[PDB]
Q: What sequence folds into this?
């Protein structure tokens, strides 16, 4: 099992899913096409912002 | 490929690999029937000879 954590913009969360092309999904962190598992995200403006 | 990502392309390529295979299957079955007919005609020629 693997757990990875980081913070991104609100509009780039959709980019996390495998397959999509863009800035964050091609230059920083991306998943393989046959990835198994899933992602979880939630708002943290009360803490980080 | 270039018009889609790499998750739902499987259903879009399965149809292009079964149809291209099922059609080939149909053609082979046609040859078997005709071969079973020529075999009956060839034996008649041998008897005639």
A:
């Amino acid at each position: 099992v693997y757990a990875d954590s980081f913070v991104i913009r609100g509009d780039e969360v959709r980019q996390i899913a495998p397959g999509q092309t863009g800035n964050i999904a091609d230059y920083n962190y991306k998943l393989p096409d046959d990835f198994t598992g899933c992602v979880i995200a939630w708002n943290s403006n009360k803490l980080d912002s | 490929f270039s018009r889609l990502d790499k998750v739902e392309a499987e259903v879009q390529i399965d149809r292009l690999i079964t149809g291209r295979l099922q059609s080939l299957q149909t053609y082979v079955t046609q040859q078997l029937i005709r071969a079973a007919e020529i075999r009956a005609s060839a034996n008649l020629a041998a008897t005639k000879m």
Q: What stands out?
A: The two ends of chain B are 61 Å apart (CA to CA). Helices of chain B lie at 9-48. Chain B touches chain A through three residues (CB under 8 Å).
